[PDB]
Design an enzyme around this catalytic site. Sequence first.
Site, short mmCIF file in Angstrom:
data_model
loop_
_atom_site.label_atom_id
_atom_site.label_comp_id
_atom_site.label_asym_id
_atom_site.label_seq_id
_atom_site.Cartn_x
_atom_site.Cartn_y
_atom_site.Cartn_z
N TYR A 45 -10.80 -23.81 3.55
CA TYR A 45 -11.02 -23.71 2.13
C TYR A 45 -12.52 -23.69 1.84
O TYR A 45 -13.32 -24.19 2.63
CB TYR A 45 -10.39 -24.85 1.33
CG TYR A 45 -11.02 -26.20 1.52
CD1 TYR A 45 -10.60 -27.04 2.54
CD2 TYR A 45 -12.05 -26.61 0.72
CE1 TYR A 45 -11.21 -28.27 2.75
CE2 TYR A 45 -12.66 -27.84 0.90
CZ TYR A 45 -12.24 -28.67 1.92
OH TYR A 45 -12.84 -29.88 2.07
N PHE A 55 -20.49 -26.99 -4.15
CA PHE A 55 -19.82 -26.14 -3.18
C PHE A 55 -19.59 -26.88 -1.86
O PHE A 55 -20.54 -27.35 -1.23
CB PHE A 55 -20.64 -24.86 -2.97
CG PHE A 55 -20.01 -23.81 -2.08
CD1 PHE A 55 -20.10 -23.90 -0.69
CD2 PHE A 55 -19.32 -22.74 -2.63
CE1 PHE A 55 -19.52 -22.93 0.12
CE2 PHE A 55 -18.75 -21.77 -1.82
CZ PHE A 55 -18.84 -21.87 -0.45
N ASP A 56 -18.32 -26.90 -1.41
CA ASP A 56 -17.89 -27.61 -0.22
C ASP A 56 -16.91 -26.71 0.53
O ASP A 56 -16.07 -26.07 -0.10
CB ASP A 56 -17.24 -28.95 -0.62
CG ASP A 56 -16.78 -29.85 0.51
OD1 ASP A 56 -17.63 -30.22 1.34
OD2 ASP A 56 -15.56 -30.21 0.54
N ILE A 75 -4.64 -33.48 -4.06
CA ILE A 75 -4.47 -33.29 -5.49
C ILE A 75 -3.23 -32.43 -5.78
O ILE A 75 -2.82 -31.59 -4.97
CB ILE A 75 -5.73 -32.69 -6.15
CG1 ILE A 75 -6.12 -31.34 -5.52
CG2 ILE A 75 -6.85 -33.70 -6.08
CD1 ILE A 75 -7.22 -30.60 -6.28
N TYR A 101 -8.67 -34.26 -10.71
CA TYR A 101 -9.20 -35.62 -10.72
C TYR A 101 -9.18 -36.23 -12.11
O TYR A 101 -9.59 -37.35 -12.27
CB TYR A 101 -10.60 -35.62 -10.14
CG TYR A 101 -10.65 -35.29 -8.66
CD1 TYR A 101 -10.47 -36.28 -7.70
CD2 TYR A 101 -10.79 -33.98 -8.22
CE1 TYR A 101 -10.51 -35.98 -6.35
CE2 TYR A 101 -10.79 -33.67 -6.88
CZ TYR A 101 -10.68 -34.68 -5.94
OH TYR A 101 -10.73 -34.42 -4.60
N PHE A 118 -10.87 -23.11 -5.94
CA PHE A 118 -10.82 -22.99 -4.49
C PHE A 118 -10.41 -21.59 -4.04
O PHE A 118 -9.60 -20.95 -4.69
CB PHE A 118 -9.78 -23.92 -3.88
CG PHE A 118 -10.08 -25.38 -4.04
CD1 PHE A 118 -9.76 -26.04 -5.21
CD2 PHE A 118 -10.76 -26.08 -3.05
CE1 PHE A 118 -10.00 -27.40 -5.33
CE2 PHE A 118 -11.04 -27.44 -3.20
CZ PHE A 118 -10.63 -28.10 -4.33
#
Length: 128
Positions: A45, A55-56, A75, A101, A118
């Site tokens: 992802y 950004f991750d 989630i 969240y 995502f």
Amino acid sequence: GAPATVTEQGEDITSKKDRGVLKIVKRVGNGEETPMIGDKVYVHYKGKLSNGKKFDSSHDRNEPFVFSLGKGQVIKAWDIGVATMKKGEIAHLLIKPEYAYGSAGSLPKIPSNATLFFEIELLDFKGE
Ligand SMILES: COc1ccc(CC[C@@H](OC(=O)[C@@H]2CCCCN2C(=O)[C@H](C)c2ccc(Cl)s2)c2cccc(OCC(=O)O)c2)cc1OC
């Protein structure tokens, strides 16, 4: 941009039809089969706040993200979204905070009431 394209063309995959989770298939997967609740799923992802920050990417770790579908290990939007996906598929999700969240967020990284984006690639999935 990719997020605005989901706003415009994304399918509402929520049960309540509140546009809480919107999806576009960006690359079609293989076969007809999508994972069952309880299946072990393997994904890559890339994620960000809707406005671009934070950004991750799992690709960071050369390391699939692995979890059990529908066990509440992730989630709500991911339990809903990944369940719609075929093996080999890349999808974009745009996610309102109620499916992420919420008002609490996860500070300082994720603010109160944040919309997330995502891109998810479903690599594989296997039964319990
Ligand atoms: C049932 O509801 C929840 C279940 C779990 C969590 C914790 C966050 C969860 O994160 C998420 O569910 C989403 C979707 C999966 C990839 C990571 N997630 C993110 O939001 C990441 C932090 C983001 C990346 C960029 C963003 Cl903007 S947000 C997560 C993060 C890291 C690891 C993990 O599992 C294994 C472990 O503990 O090692 C699970 C939060 C939940 O609700 C708010």
